Ligand binder design. Sequence first.
Ligand SMILES: CCc1nnc(NCc2ccc3[nH]ccc3c2)s1
Length: 220
Amino acid sequence: ATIGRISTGSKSLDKLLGGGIETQAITEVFGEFGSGKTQLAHTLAVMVQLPPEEGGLNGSVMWIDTENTFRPERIREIAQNRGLDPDEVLKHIAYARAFNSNHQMLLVQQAEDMIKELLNTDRPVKLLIVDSLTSHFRSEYIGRGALAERQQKLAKHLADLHRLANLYDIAVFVTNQVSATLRVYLRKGKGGKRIARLIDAPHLPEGEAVFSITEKGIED
Ligand SMILES: CCc1nnc(NCc2ccc3[nH]ccc3c2)s1
């Protein structure tokens, strides 16, 4: 399949990303508290449900939440402010809480069942969110004596995610805080705006995009 792209809601950020976040790829977004990385996740979970003419992929979403940062009311607000039915939008986000790093890995393994079920339907899974990729690994694997095993498990988790992205034409979007991922770093800008910086992309130039966080989620 040709690579599909999901608009972030921000024209500036889309331009930096070559059009939006890509299917068949993992986009990994870093930021401290209030950076906007989870707001971007929420916005993408709405945008992907739009038709391609409006920046979506007519897709369903699967969402893995490690720290209780998913806000259904925020989905509803973004959806309604973009003209979608808020209840329909929520029905097409399959939510799972991950309680620890092992459970997080099992959820990605067992997400393939729903992906397969939806694959040839009107709403195939097009976005798989892991917010956040590392919170449980960081909590559970303390010290340099634990680093080797932490990295091995995380590498296998990322491999599982890459396989789903490539085999089923899904955009994987993960959050992180400071491995074949496209890495975007968010920071506070001036006047309450946020800045995204793209770093180390093999085939996209580094650059920055300024965006806002509004009732529509993220936009210029
Ligand atoms: C590990 C035990 C399971 N618990 N739930 C499962 N399958 C159902 C399910 C529902 C929504 C989901 N969003 C992301 C993954 C996902 C999965 S398998």
